Amino acid sequence: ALKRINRELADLGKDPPSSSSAGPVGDDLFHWQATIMGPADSPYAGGVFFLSIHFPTDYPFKPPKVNFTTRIYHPNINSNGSICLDILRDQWSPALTISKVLLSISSLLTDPNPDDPLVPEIAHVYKTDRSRYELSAREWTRKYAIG
Amino acid sequence: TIDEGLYSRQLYVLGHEAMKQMSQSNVLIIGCKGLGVEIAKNVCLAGVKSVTLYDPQPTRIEDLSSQYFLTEDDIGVPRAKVTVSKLAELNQYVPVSVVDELSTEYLKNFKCVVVTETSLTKQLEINDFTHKNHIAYIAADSRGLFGSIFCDFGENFICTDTDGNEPLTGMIASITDDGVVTMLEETRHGLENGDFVKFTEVKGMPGLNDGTPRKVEVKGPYTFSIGSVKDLGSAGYNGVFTQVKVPTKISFKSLRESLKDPEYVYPDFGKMMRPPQYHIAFQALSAFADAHEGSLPRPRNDIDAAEFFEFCKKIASTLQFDVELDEKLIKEISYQARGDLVAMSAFLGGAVAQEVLKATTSKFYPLKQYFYFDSLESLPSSVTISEETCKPRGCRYDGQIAVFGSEFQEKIASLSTFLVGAGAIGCEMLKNWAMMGVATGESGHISVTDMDSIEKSNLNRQFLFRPRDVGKLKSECASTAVSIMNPSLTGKITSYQERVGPESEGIFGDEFFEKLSLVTNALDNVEARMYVDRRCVFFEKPLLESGTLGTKGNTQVVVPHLTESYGSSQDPPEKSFPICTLKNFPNRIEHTIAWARDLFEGLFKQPIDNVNMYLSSPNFLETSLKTSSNPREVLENIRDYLVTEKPLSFEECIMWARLQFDKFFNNNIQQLLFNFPKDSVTSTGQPFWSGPKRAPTPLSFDIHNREHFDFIVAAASLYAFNYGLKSETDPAIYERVLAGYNPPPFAPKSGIANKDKQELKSIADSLPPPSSLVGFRLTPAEFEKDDDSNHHIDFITAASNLRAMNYDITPADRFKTKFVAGKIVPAMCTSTAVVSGLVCLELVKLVDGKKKIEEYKNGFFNLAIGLFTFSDPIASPKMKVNGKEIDKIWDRYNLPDCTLQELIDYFQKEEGLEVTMLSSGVSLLYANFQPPKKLAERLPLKISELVEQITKKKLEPFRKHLVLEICCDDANGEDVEVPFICIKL
Amino acid sequence: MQIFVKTLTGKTITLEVESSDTIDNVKSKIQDKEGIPPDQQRLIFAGKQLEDGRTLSDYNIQKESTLHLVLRLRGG
Amino acid sequence: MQIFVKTLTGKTITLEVESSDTIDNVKSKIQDKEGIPPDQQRLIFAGKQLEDGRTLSDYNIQKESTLHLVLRLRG
Numbered sequence A: 001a002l003k004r005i006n007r008e009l010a011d012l013g014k015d016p017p018s019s020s021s022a023g024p025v026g027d028d029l030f031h032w033q034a035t036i037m038g039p040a041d042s043p044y045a046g047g048v049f050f051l052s053i054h055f056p057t058d059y060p061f062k063p064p065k066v067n068f069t070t071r072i073y074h075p076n077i078n079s080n081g082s083i084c085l086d087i088l089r090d091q092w093s094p095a096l097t098i099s100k101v102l103l104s105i106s107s108l109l110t111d112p113n114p115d116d117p118l119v120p121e122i123a124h125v126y127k128t129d130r131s132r133y134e135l136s137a138r139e140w141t142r143k144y145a146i147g
Numbered sequence B: 001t002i003d004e005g006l007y008s009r010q011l012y013v014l015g016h017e018a019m020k021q022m023s024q025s026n027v028l029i030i031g032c033k034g035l036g037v038e039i040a041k042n043v044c045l046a047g048v049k050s051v052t053l054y055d056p057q058p059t060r061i062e063d064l065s066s067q068y069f070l071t072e073d074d075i076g077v078p079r080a081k082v083t084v085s086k087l088a089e090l091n092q093y094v095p096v097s098v099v100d101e102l103s104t105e106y107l108k109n110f111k112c113v114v115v116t117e118t119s120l121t122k123q124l125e126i127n128d129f130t131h132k133n134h135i136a137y138i139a140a141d142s143r144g145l146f147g148s149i150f151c152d153f154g155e156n157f158i159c160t161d162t163d164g165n166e167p168l169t170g171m172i173a174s175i176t177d178d179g180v181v182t183m184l185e186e187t188r189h190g191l192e193n194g195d196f197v198k199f200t201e202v203k204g205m206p207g208l209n210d211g212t213p214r215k216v217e218v219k220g221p222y223t224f225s226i227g228s229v230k231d232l233g234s235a236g237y238n239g240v241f242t243q244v245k246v247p248t249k250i251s252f253k254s255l256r257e258s259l260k261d262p263e264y265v266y267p268d269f270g271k272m273m274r275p276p277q278y279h280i281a282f283q284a285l286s287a288f289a290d291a292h293e294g295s296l297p298r299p300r301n302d303i304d305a306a307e308f309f310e311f312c313k314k315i316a317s318t319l320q321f322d323v324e325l326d327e328k329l330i331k332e333i334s335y336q337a338r339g340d341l342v343a344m345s346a347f348l349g350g351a352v353a354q355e356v357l358k359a360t361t362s363k364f365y366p367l368k369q370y371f372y373f374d375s376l377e378s379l380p381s382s383v384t385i386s387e388e389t390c391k392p393r394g395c396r397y398d399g400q401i402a403v404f405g406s407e408f409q410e411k412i413a414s415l416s417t418f419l420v421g422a423g424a425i426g427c428e429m430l431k432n433w434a435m436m437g438v439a440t441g442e443s444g445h446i447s448v449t450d451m452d453s454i455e456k457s458n459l460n461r462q463f464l465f466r467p468r469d470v471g472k473l474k475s476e477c478a479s480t481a482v483s484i485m486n487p488s489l490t491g492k493i494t495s496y497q498e499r500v501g502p503e504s505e506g507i508f509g510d511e512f513f514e515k516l517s518l519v520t521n522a523l524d525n526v527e528a529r530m531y532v533d534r535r536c537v538f539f540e541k542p543l544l545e546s547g548t549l550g551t552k553g554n555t556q557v558v559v560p561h562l563t564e565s566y567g568s569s570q571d572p573p574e575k576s577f578p579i580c581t582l583k584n585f586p587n588r589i590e591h592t593i594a595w596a597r598d599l600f601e602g603l604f605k606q607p608i609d610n611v612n613m614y615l616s617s618p619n620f621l622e623t624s625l626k627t628s629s630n631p632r633e634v635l636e637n638i639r640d641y642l643v644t645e646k647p648l649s650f651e652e653c654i655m656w657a658r659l660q661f662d663k664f665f666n667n668n669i670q671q672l673l674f675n676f677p678k679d680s681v682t683s684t685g686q687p688f689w690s691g692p693k694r695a696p697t698p699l700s701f702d703i704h705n706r707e708h709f710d711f712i713v714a715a716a717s718l719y720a721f722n723y724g725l726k727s728e729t730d731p732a733i734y735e736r737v738l739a740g741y742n743p744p745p746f747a748p749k750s751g752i753a754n755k756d757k758q759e760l761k762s763i764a765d766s767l768p769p770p771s772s773l774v775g776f777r778l779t780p781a782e783f784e785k786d787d788d789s790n791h792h793i794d795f796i797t798a799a800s801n802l803r804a805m806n807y808d809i810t811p812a813d814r815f816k817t818k819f820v821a822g823k824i825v826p827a828m829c830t831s832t833a834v835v836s837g838l839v840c841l842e843l844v845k846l847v848d849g850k851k852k853i854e855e856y857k858n859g860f861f862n863l864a865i866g867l868f869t870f871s872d873p874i875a876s877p878k879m880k881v882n883g884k885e886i887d888k889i890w891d892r893y894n895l896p897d898c899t900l901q902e903l904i905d906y907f908q909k910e911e912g913l914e915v916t917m918l919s920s921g922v923s924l925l926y927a928n929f930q931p932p933k934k935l936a937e938r939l940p941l942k943i944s945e946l947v948e949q950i951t952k953k954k955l956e957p958f959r960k961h962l963v964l965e966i967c968c969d970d971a972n973g974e975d976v977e978v979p980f981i982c983i984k985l
Numbered sequence C: 001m002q003i004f005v006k007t008l009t010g011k012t013i014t015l016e017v018e019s020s021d022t023i024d025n026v027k028s029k030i031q032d033k034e035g036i037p038p039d040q041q042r043l044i045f046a047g048k049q050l051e052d053g054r055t056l057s058d059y060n061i062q063k064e065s066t067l068h069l070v071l072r073l074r075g076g
Numbered sequence D: 001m002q003i004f005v006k007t008l009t010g011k012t013i014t015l016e017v018e019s020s021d022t023i024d025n026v027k028s029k030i031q032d033k034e035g036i037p038p039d040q041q042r043l044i045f046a047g048k049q050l051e052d053g054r055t056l057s058d059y060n061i062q063k064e065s066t067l068h069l070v071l072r073l074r075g
């Protein structure tokens, strides 16, 4: 696991992710702290979201545990930071890199999926009153994702 | 009336009906040697109605080679008489008897008849009777490293289950007018051509819901066909399908008929020409015994071998067998005629016991009809095996010396093994080692470790433990039992109660491991397997891995510098459901059981832990306010469980349980339906509650309903346990308390600054001070499935069934709920016996020090279908480093405790490689991209000092080495893999 | 060429292959028909475990040959 | 030519296509008409699932053939 994790880290260092920056916490290779920038064409524009990534002892044969640490008002992210992503629960394979996961999370942020929601109330607000959802998302990203 | 406290693991393999039929079947066993006693033990543990033994032959010393119920004080006593008393203790529900004489008509009292150590004429005489009276007949034989099984269940055997798999079920998406059934998105039905299915809940085609099975024509992994459904309708939508398993009729031939034209079962496809040879060889053995007053050929005797081969020629000519006899193999069968190995006995006994259970239950596919097996690759080649070394010495190991010799006996007697785990496989392994004489020499020793204690359910397949041993440590009991079996092991066994893992390296350290000869795993989880595999790889010790699951099993061997390790291959992972499915949209009972388990943890475990930690840690609040993802939840839990909702009697517990019922089965559903009404549609215009999403309906509490009352009782009892109150079970108090309950009004909420922190502070300071409460603690509930009086499984079952009623899912019972929630692994005694036999057959290969990789076999088997297969181990991969051949697995660098700069310089000058990353454990000691100041600080330090500084933990005094992982690049910049580094402290 | 694969659970699978196909192609076909990733498949023919990077003709696998698809178990 | 695509709810969509048209183009037409992303469209004909990168002629789709459209939902 150590060699794979270091290879991914070096690959990140070589070619910058531009919109993301993940690295080990202190000197522990199995605990990373990543950062994601809110897409410009989204309610979360101009926001910095911190994620915690926990590689299991069996990596890459078990998915990393990725949790948001910043509060976000999204139909697919709940108060614990859990992310409704298929590739993190049962579709995980030992061929996906952390950069792919970060790109998937950014794409999820750019457009939510209210048809299979994790937070039914936010999904209902999104489906019925879109403008209120936009205002709430902007308020939350200004209150938590900036500073 | 099956005692589920004992047959818990076996019922998950067989079932209630199968065991009900088993409990009414009688088994007769002729022969009480190692094979016979193994079969009888497995049958008694299985749970047949009764067992009868017939063996009037007086005991002899050599019989102790594989008979573990015989002692040296029983010489001259009939074997059955001395074995019945010890067999009667294995299971209290299975009487064991002895008959001094056998008459043909007496056979009519038995459901199954097993025959061992009997001549062919007697077998023909018995089978001529059993066949025409419809009695299952099994005949087993074990000669040295060769074995044979024959089954004859009658001309009209009815098999109800042919593979032992659960019926397949699936969710449909659409059924066209031509019967083309399509599965949901990316879902496989798993059917085969010729299967039968029945449909339910199909809309648009009500005619398919009657329940008549229909033929299945598989057209792809996602679709199949059922025929023409023109009349029933035009097109069907949604619904579910379930496979229907139909009985089969199997016709067996009598032994007399099948001798001429046998039907073979092949345990190995690599040698398909052998079973025809063994068929002649075993008959020749019987003829030779008949011609010499029942005496088999003497060990490694050439005259007897020649006469035996003459008999083989005669038999082959008589039967018009157009097969060329392999002289070497047949004479090998002759040489080992008097062999009696405990490993072969265990293997064949497990197989034959499974066949007996098939006969008595009409389940699983039986052997049809001849099963000839050999493990001739285990014959030693590093020692002298001749007539002089194989002659008997008048000791209990004669049956083994007749195959391996005295020099190999000396080799076995000085082994130093290490057995990890003392479960079913551990007990079988200890028995096999005791019988084989392992570690009975001056320099021998056995070490066994296991941190668990004996429980009632373990007695069903761990025959070394008795009911009086419940509550004691497994390792001590196993060591004492095997010291009773073989007295020479007194003082040669050491038992530890230590878990093998990173925390026990102070006991199983360098000194402990350097003295071993091999390691044998008997574990039940993959983490321990991987850890022990890594330790064996580091210390370069042979490893024997084995595993079982229901009727399936496998065994693998890891040999230093020859094969790959256990961790070089990948296994399928456990399936975990998406959080969105469990939280809101379940459609299977497994989802509701997982939800109920999470609810149990969140109601009776987490709040109690938070309250207790608040009353112990002086700085708990501040740490929680910035550590947890929801400090508000922690504060609310503490407040509710300390002041707001602290019960003073059991009536308040009942009221709390009623409130929780409302919270989790009536109000959350109302909120969910407020967010997504049943008539809502998706963004594409499709209905929202279609397919995998089922529309729920709120539950209204009714005291008379059984599930509601069960939930109330279990929740109130668990809450009282948390607060230490006196619970009750009389329905009168529950009905009286719940009558006067006024539900608070509830209305779903439509929704519509920094003061929240002030509110959190106000809540925090409102809590009573820890000083005011000293010595006060709340007892958390620790999940325990094996106790049927703590209400854990009762609560989980009630919650799961209530949530199933919410979403219109078919509820399950306590049996299936315990199976799913407890992560129980089905277990059988027969599979354990087979795997132990295979492992002990590989152990002799390891002891002999075989070098070629084609001489070892990894084994896989499924007894439900009678499948056995073997394959050579995979050789360890090689690589080129600096123009040198390096083993990717078993090679390492040995360096002194130098500085980091010196290590880098050594790798640059010696291997011509540039070090880019260096890590130890879970820490990054050095990386090429670190800032220059940090490196300049870390460069002149020794590796031990660097590890201590980075990990912030001093190395223990017992630590004698460090393992480092290094990634380096060549001169051109291409990354080259290198083996790990072993720094000697 | 047509070959058969028998699973440890009793299922049978029919594959249409050629003698020149690599073991990787066979594993991919088995994944298509069963969903088992190639890295988790253990194929046995005539007492030899098939390894990636080689061809069928290396193992003398001819038409109507029977392979066994096996797996390890964690109990015990 | 013309073809018909039936959905899980009983709706029928008529499409004007050619035997040489790729599956991707047909999925693009279905996305333009119904708004369903191609990645979530699962088209089935005669018990076989249509795969991207191929053409209708590869599946022997002819005049006025009938397909079935189901949808997979991202988790």
Ligand SMILES: Nc1ncnc2c1ncn2[C@@H]1O[C@H](COP(=O)(O)OP(=O)(O)OP(=O)(O)O)[C@@H](O)[C@H]1O
Binding pocket: B009, B420, B421, B422, B423, B424, B425, B449, B450, B451, B452, B458, B474, B498, B499, B500, B501, B522, B523, B524, B525, B528, B825, B827, C075, C076
């Ligand atoms: N890391 C470990 N170190 C030492 N012994 C272990 C370890 N993990 C498991 N064991 C032991 O291995 C044995 C596993 O055998 P088995 O699974 O048949 O027993 P069990 O877990 O007690 O029973 P059951 O699974 O039927 O409830 C048990 O003795 C267990 O204590």
Ligand SMILES: [Mg+2]
Binding pocket: B452, B453, B455
């Ligand atoms: Mg236990």
Ligand SMILES: [Mg+2]
Binding pocket: B524
């Ligand atoms: Mg266990």
